[PDB]
JSON list of N, CA and C in Angstrom, two decimals:
[
{"chain": "O", "resi": 1, "resn": "UNK", "atom": "N", "xyz": [-34.13, 29.19, 4.23]},
{"chain": "O", "resi": 1, "resn": "UNK", "atom": "CA", "xyz": [-34.26, 28.46, 2.95]},
{"chain": "O", "resi": 1, "resn": "UNK", "atom": "C", "xyz": [-35.39, 27.43, 3.01]},
{"chain": "O", "resi": 2, "resn": "UNK", "atom": "N", "xyz": [-36.18, 27.38, 1.94]},
{"chain": "O", "resi": 2, "resn": "UNK", "atom": "CA", "xyz": [-37.30, 26.45, 1.87]},
{"chain": "O", "resi": 2, "resn": "UNK", "atom": "C", "xyz": [-36.80, 25.01, 1.73]},
{"chain": "O", "resi": 3, "resn": "UNK", "atom": "N", "xyz": [-37.70, 24.06, 1.96]},
{"chain": "O", "resi": 3, "resn": "UNK", "atom": "CA", "xyz": [-37.35, 22.64, 1.86]},
{"chain": "O", "resi": 3, "resn": "UNK", "atom": "C", "xyz": [-38.37, 21.88, 1.02]},
{"chain": "O", "resi": 4, "resn": "UNK", "atom": "N", "xyz": [-37.98, 21.51, -0.19]},
{"chain": "O", "resi": 4, "resn": "UNK", "atom": "CA", "xyz": [-38.87, 20.77, -1.08]},
{"chain": "O", "resi": 4, "resn": "UNK", "atom": "C", "xyz": [-39.52, 19.60, -0.36]},
{"chain": "O", "resi": 5, "resn": "UNK", "atom": "N", "xyz": [-38.73, 18.89, 0.44]},
{"chain": "O", "resi": 5, "resn": "UNK", "atom": "CA", "xyz": [-39.26, 17.75, 1.17]},
{"chain": "O", "resi": 5, "resn": "UNK", "atom": "C", "xyz": [-38.18, 16.74, 1.52]},
{"chain": "O", "resi": 6, "resn": "UNK", "atom": "N", "xyz": [-37.07, 16.78, 0.78]},
{"chain": "O", "resi": 6, "resn": "UNK", "atom": "CA", "xyz": [-35.97, 15.86, 1.01]},
{"chain": "O", "resi": 6, "resn": "UNK", "atom": "C", "xyz": [-35.80, 15.57, 2.50]},
{"chain": "O", "resi": 7, "resn": "UNK", "atom": "N", "xyz": [-35.18, 16.50, 3.21]},
{"chain": "O", "resi": 7, "resn": "UNK", "atom": "CA", "xyz": [-34.95, 16.35, 4.64]},
{"chain": "O", "resi": 7, "resn": "UNK", "atom": "C", "xyz": [-36.18, 15.76, 5.33]},
{"chain": "O", "resi": 8, "resn": "UNK", "atom": "N", "xyz": [-37.36, 16.16, 4.86]},
{"chain": "O", "resi": 8, "resn": "UNK", "atom": "CA", "xyz": [-38.62, 15.67, 5.42]},
{"chain": "O", "resi": 8, "resn": "UNK", "atom": "C", "xyz": [-38.65, 14.16, 5.45]},
{"chain": "O", "resi": 9, "resn": "UNK", "atom": "N", "xyz": [-38.58, 13.56, 4.27]},
{"chain": "O", "resi": 9, "resn": "UNK", "atom": "CA", "xyz": [-38.62, 12.11, 4.16]},
{"chain": "O", "resi": 9, "resn": "UNK", "atom": "C", "xyz": [-37.40, 11.49, 4.83]},
{"chain": "O", "resi": 10, "resn": "UNK", "atom": "N", "xyz": [-36.37, 12.30, 5.05]},
{"chain": "O", "resi": 10, "resn": "UNK", "atom": "CA", "xyz": [-35.15, 11.82, 5.70]},
{"chain": "O", "resi": 10, "resn": "UNK", "atom": "C", "xyz": [-35.37, 11.76, 7.21]},
{"chain": "O", "resi": 11, "resn": "UNK", "atom": "N", "xyz": [-36.30, 12.59, 7.67]},
{"chain": "O", "resi": 11, "resn": "UNK", "atom": "CA", "xyz": [-36.66, 12.63, 9.08]},
{"chain": "O", "resi": 11, "resn": "UNK", "atom": "C", "xyz": [-37.41, 11.39, 9.37]},
{"chain": "O", "resi": 12, "resn": "UNK", "atom": "N", "xyz": [-38.34, 11.16, 8.49]},
{"chain": "O", "resi": 12, "resn": "UNK", "atom": "CA", "xyz": [-39.18, 10.01, 8.56]},
{"chain": "O", "resi": 12, "resn": "UNK", "atom": "C", "xyz": [-38.34, 8.75, 8.63]},
{"chain": "O", "resi": 13, "resn": "UNK", "atom": "N", "xyz": [-37.49, 8.58, 7.64]},
{"chain": "O", "resi": 13, "resn": "UNK", "atom": "CA", "xyz": [-36.62, 7.42, 7.54]},
{"chain": "O", "resi": 13, "resn": "UNK", "atom": "C", "xyz": [-35.74, 7.23, 8.78]},
{"chain": "O", "resi": 14, "resn": "UNK", "atom": "N", "xyz": [-35.20, 8.30, 9.34]},
{"chain": "O", "resi": 14, "resn": "UNK", "atom": "CA", "xyz": [-34.37, 8.15, 10.54]},
{"chain": "O", "resi": 14, "resn": "UNK", "atom": "C", "xyz": [-35.27, 7.68, 11.68]},
{"chain": "O", "resi": 15, "resn": "UNK", "atom": "N", "xyz": [-36.13, 8.59, 12.11]},
{"chain": "O", "resi": 15, "resn": "UNK", "atom": "CA", "xyz": [-37.08, 8.30, 13.15]},
{"chain": "O", "resi": 15, "resn": "UNK", "atom": "C", "xyz": [-37.85, 7.04, 12.81]},
{"chain": "O", "resi": 16, "resn": "UNK", "atom": "N", "xyz": [-37.87, 6.72, 11.53]},
{"chain": "O", "resi": 16, "resn": "UNK", "atom": "CA", "xyz": [-38.53, 5.52, 11.04]},
{"chain": "O", "resi": 16, "resn": "UNK", "atom": "C", "xyz": [-37.87, 4.30, 11.65]},
{"chain": "O", "resi": 17, "resn": "UNK", "atom": "N", "xyz": [-36.64, 4.06, 11.22]},
{"chain": "O", "resi": 17, "resn": "UNK", "atom": "CA", "xyz": [-35.86, 2.94, 11.75]},
{"chain": "O", "resi": 17, "resn": "UNK", "atom": "C", "xyz": [-36.15, 2.81, 13.24]},
{"chain": "O", "resi": 18, "resn": "UNK", "atom": "N", "xyz": [-36.45, 3.95, 13.86]},
{"chain": "O", "resi": 18, "resn": "UNK", "atom": "CA", "xyz": [-36.78, 4.00, 15.27]},
{"chain": "O", "resi": 18, "resn": "UNK", "atom": "C", "xyz": [-38.22, 3.56, 15.53]},
{"chain": "O", "resi": 19, "resn": "UNK", "atom": "N", "xyz": [-38.71, 2.59, 14.77]},
{"chain": "O", "resi": 19, "resn": "UNK", "atom": "CA", "xyz": [-40.07, 2.12, 14.94]},
{"chain": "O", "resi": 19, "resn": "UNK", "atom": "C", "xyz": [-41.10, 3.23, 14.85]},
{"chain": "O", "resi": 20, "resn": "UNK", "atom": "N", "xyz": [-40.99, 4.06, 13.82]},
{"chain": "O", "resi": 20, "resn": "UNK", "atom": "CA", "xyz": [-41.91, 5.17, 13.63]},
{"chain": "O", "resi": 20, "resn": "UNK", "atom": "C", "xyz": [-42.21, 5.41, 12.15]},
{"chain": "O", "resi": 21, "resn": "UNK", "atom": "N", "xyz": [-43.24, 4.74, 11.65]},
{"chain": "O", "resi": 21, "resn": "UNK", "atom": "CA", "xyz": [-43.64, 4.88, 10.25]},
{"chain": "O", "resi": 21, "resn": "UNK", "atom": "C", "xyz": [-43.54, 6.33, 9.79]},
{"chain": "O", "resi": 22, "resn": "UNK", "atom": "N", "xyz": [-43.28, 6.51, 8.50]},
{"chain": "O", "resi": 22, "resn": "UNK", "atom": "CA", "xyz": [-43.14, 7.83, 7.90]},
{"chain": "O", "resi": 22, "resn": "UNK", "atom": "C", "xyz": [-44.30, 8.75, 8.27]},
{"chain": "O", "resi": 23, "resn": "UNK", "atom": "N", "xyz": [-45.48, 8.18, 8.42]},
{"chain": "O", "resi": 23, "resn": "UNK", "atom": "CA", "xyz": [-46.67, 8.98, 8.70]},
{"chain": "O", "resi": 23, "resn": "UNK", "atom": "C", "xyz": [-46.75, 9.49, 10.14]},
{"chain": "O", "resi": 24, "resn": "UNK", "atom": "N", "xyz": [-46.32, 8.69, 11.10]},
{"chain": "O", "resi": 24, "resn": "UNK", "atom": "CA", "xyz": [-46.38, 9.09, 12.48]},
{"chain": "O", "resi": 24, "resn": "UNK", "atom": "C", "xyz": [-45.39, 10.20, 12.78]},
{"chain": "O", "resi": 25, "resn": "UNK", "atom": "N", "xyz": [-44.25, 10.10, 12.14]},
{"chain": "O", "resi": 25, "resn": "UNK", "atom": "CA", "xyz": [-43.18, 11.06, 12.32]},
{"chain": "O", "resi": 25, "resn": "UNK", "atom": "C", "xyz": [-43.38, 12.29, 11.47]},
{"chain": "O", "resi": 26, "resn": "UNK", "atom": "N", "xyz": [-43.89, 12.12, 10.26]},
{"chain": "O", "resi": 26, "resn": "UNK", "atom": "CA", "xyz": [-44.15, 13.26, 9.40]},
{"chain": "O", "resi": 26, "resn": "UNK", "atom": "C", "xyz": [-45.28, 14.07, 9.98]},
{"chain": "O", "resi": 27, "resn": "UNK", "atom": "N", "xyz": [-46.27, 13.37, 10.50]},
{"chain": "O", "resi": 27, "resn": "UNK", "atom": "CA", "xyz": [-47.39, 14.02, 11.16]},
{"chain": "O", "resi": 27, "resn": "UNK", "atom": "C", "xyz": [-46.84, 14.62, 12.44]},
{"chain": "O", "resi": 28, "resn": "UNK", "atom": "N", "xyz": [-45.80, 13.98, 12.95]},
{"chain": "O", "resi": 28, "resn": "UNK", "atom": "CA", "xyz": [-45.13, 14.48, 14.12]},
{"chain": "O", "resi": 28, "resn": "UNK", "atom": "C", "xyz": [-44.36, 15.71, 13.72]},
{"chain": "O", "resi": 29, "resn": "UNK", "atom": "N", "xyz": [-43.99, 15.77, 12.43]},
{"chain": "O", "resi": 29, "resn": "UNK", "atom": "CA", "xyz": [-43.28, 16.92, 11.89]},
{"chain": "O", "resi": 29, "resn": "UNK", "atom": "C", "xyz": [-44.27, 18.06, 11.77]},
{"chain": "O", "resi": 30, "resn": "UNK", "atom": "N", "xyz": [-45.50, 17.73, 11.41]},
{"chain": "O", "resi": 30, "resn": "UNK", "atom": "CA", "xyz": [-46.54, 18.73, 11.33]},
{"chain": "O", "resi": 30, "resn": "UNK", "atom": "C", "xyz": [-46.75, 19.26, 12.73]},
{"chain": "O", "resi": 31, "resn": "UNK", "atom": "N", "xyz": [-46.48, 18.39, 13.70]},
{"chain": "O", "resi": 31, "resn": "UNK", "atom": "CA", "xyz": [-46.61, 18.73, 15.11]},
{"chain": "O", "resi": 31, "resn": "UNK", "atom": "C", "xyz": [-45.25, 19.12, 15.73]},
{"chain": "O", "resi": 32, "resn": "UNK", "atom": "N", "xyz": [-44.17, 18.96, 14.95]},
{"chain": "O", "resi": 32, "resn": "UNK", "atom": "CA", "xyz": [-42.83, 19.29, 15.43]},
{"chain": "O", "resi": 32, "resn": "UNK", "atom": "C", "xyz": [-42.32, 20.57, 14.78]},
{"chain": "O", "resi": 33, "resn": "UNK", "atom": "N", "xyz": [-43.05, 21.05, 13.78]},
{"chain": "O", "resi": 33, "resn": "UNK", "atom": "CA", "xyz": [-42.66, 22.24, 13.05]},
{"chain": "O", "resi": 33, "resn": "UNK", "atom": "C", "xyz": [-41.71, 21.87, 11.90]},
{"chain": "O", "resi": 34, "resn": "UNK", "atom": "N", "xyz": [-41.63, 20.56, 11.60]},
{"chain": "O", "resi": 34, "resn": "UNK", "atom": "CA", "xyz": [-40.77, 20.05, 10.53]},
{"chain": "O", "resi": 34, "resn": "UNK", "atom": "C", "xyz": [-39.51, 19.42, 11.09]},
{"chain": "O", "resi": 35, "resn": "UNK", "atom": "N", "xyz": [-39.31, 19.56, 12.39]},
{"chain": "O", "resi": 35, "resn": "UNK", "atom": "CA", "xyz": [-38.13, 18.97, 13.02]},
{"chain": "O", "resi": 35, "resn": "UNK", "atom": "C", "xyz": [-38.29, 17.47, 13.10]},
{"chain": "O", "resi": 36, "resn": "UNK", "atom": "N", "xyz": [-37.18, 16.73, 13.03]},
{"chain": "O", "resi": 36, "resn": "UNK", "atom": "CA", "xyz": [-37.18, 15.29, 13.09]},
{"chain": "O", "resi": 36, "resn": "UNK", "atom": "C", "xyz": [-37.02, 14.80, 14.51]},
{"chain": "O", "resi": 37, "resn": "UNK", "atom": "N", "xyz": [-35.91, 15.17, 15.12]},
{"chain": "O", "resi": 37, "resn": "UNK", "atom": "CA", "xyz": [-35.62, 14.79, 16.49]},
{"chain": "O", "resi": 37, "resn": "UNK", "atom": "C", "xyz": [-36.82, 15.10, 17.36]},
{"chain": "O", "resi": 38, "resn": "UNK", "atom": "N", "xyz": [-37.37, 16.31, 17.21]},
{"chain": "O", "resi": 38, "resn": "UNK", "atom": "CA", "xyz": [-38.55, 16.71, 17.96]},
{"chain": "O", "resi": 38, "resn": "UNK", "atom": "C", "xyz": [-39.72, 15.88, 17.47]},
{"chain": "O", "resi": 39, "resn": "UNK", "atom": "N", "xyz": [-39.65, 15.52, 16.19]},
{"chain": "O", "resi": 39, "resn": "UNK", "atom": "CA", "xyz": [-40.66, 14.70, 15.55]},
{"chain": "O", "resi": 39, "resn": "UNK", "atom": "C", "xyz": [-40.85, 13.38, 16.29]},
{"chain": "O", "resi": 40, "resn": "UNK", "atom": "N", "xyz": [-39.74, 12.84, 16.79]},
{"chain": "O", "resi": 40, "resn": "UNK", "atom": "CA", "xyz": [-39.77, 11.57, 17.49]},
{"chain": "O", "resi": 40, "resn": "UNK", "atom": "C", "xyz": [-40.00, 11.77, 18.97]},
{"chain": "O", "resi": 41, "resn": "UNK", "atom": "N", "xyz": [-39.46, 12.84, 19.50]},
{"chain": "O", "resi": 41, "resn": "UNK", "atom": "CA", "xyz": [-39.72, 13.17, 20.89]},
{"chain": "O", "resi": 41, "resn": "UNK", "atom": "C", "xyz": [-41.23, 13.38, 20.98]},
{"chain": "O", "resi": 42, "resn": "UNK", "atom": "N", "xyz": [-41.81, 13.66, 19.81]},
{"chain": "O", "resi": 42, "resn": "UNK", "atom": "CA", "xyz": [-43.23, 13.84, 19.66]},
{"chain": "O", "resi": 42, "resn": "UNK", "atom": "C", "xyz": [-43.86, 12.47, 19.56]},
{"chain": "O", "resi": 43, "resn": "UNK", "atom": "N", "xyz": [-43.24, 11.62, 18.75]},
{"chain": "O", "resi": 43, "resn": "UNK", "atom": "CA", "xyz": [-43.67, 10.25, 18.60]},
{"chain": "O", "resi": 43, "resn": "UNK", "atom": "C", "xyz": [-43.90, 9.67, 19.98]},
{"chain": "O", "resi": 44, "resn": "UNK", "atom": "N", "xyz": [-43.11, 10.18, 20.92]},
{"chain": "O", "resi": 44, "resn": "UNK", "atom": "CA", "xyz": [-43.13, 9.77, 22.31]},
{"chain": "O", "resi": 44, "resn": "UNK", "atom": "C", "xyz": [-44.32, 10.37, 23.05]},
{"chain": "O", "resi": 45, "resn": "UNK", "atom": "N", "xyz": [-44.17, 11.63, 23.46]},
{"chain": "O", "resi": 45, "resn": "UNK", "atom": "CA", "xyz": [-45.22, 12.33, 24.19]},
{"chain": "O", "resi": 45, "resn": "UNK", "atom": "C", "xyz": [-46.61, 11.87, 23.76]},
{"chain": "O", "resi": 46, "resn": "UNK", "atom": "N", "xyz": [-46.74, 11.53, 22.49]},
{"chain": "O", "resi": 46, "resn": "UNK", "atom": "CA", "xyz": [-48.02, 11.07, 21.97]},
{"chain": "O", "resi": 46, "resn": "UNK", "atom": "C", "xyz": [-48.79, 12.17, 21.26]},
{"chain": "O", "resi": 47, "resn": "UNK", "atom": "N", "xyz": [-49.07, 11.96, 19.98]},
{"chain": "O", "resi": 47, "resn": "UNK", "atom": "CA", "xyz": [-49.80, 12.94, 19.19]},
{"chain": "O", "resi": 47, "resn": "UNK", "atom": "C", "xyz": [-51.12, 13.31, 19.86]},
{"chain": "O", "resi": 48, "resn": "UNK", "atom": "N", "xyz": [-51.19, 14.52, 20.43]},
{"chain": "O", "resi": 48, "resn": "UNK", "atom": "CA", "xyz": [-52.40, 15.01, 21.11]},
{"chain": "O", "resi": 48, "resn": "UNK", "atom": "C", "xyz": [-53.65, 14.84, 20.25]},
{"chain": "O", "resi": 49, "resn": "UNK", "atom": "N", "xyz": [-53.70, 15.57, 19.15]},
{"chain": "O", "resi": 49, "resn": "UNK", "atom": "CA", "xyz": [-54.84, 15.50, 18.26]},
{"chain": "O", "resi": 49, "resn": "UNK", "atom": "C", "xyz": [-54.91, 14.17, 17.52]}
]
């Protein structure tokens, strides 16, 4: 099922509270495949590009 974006911004907001602006995590989503948890584990490893 497709995702308009809801969960997306919800990833941001969660990982957000975790000291991760919507952009770092969403971009992390672009780098996480849309996943949030991975989005932050990404926030960690450090955005390669």
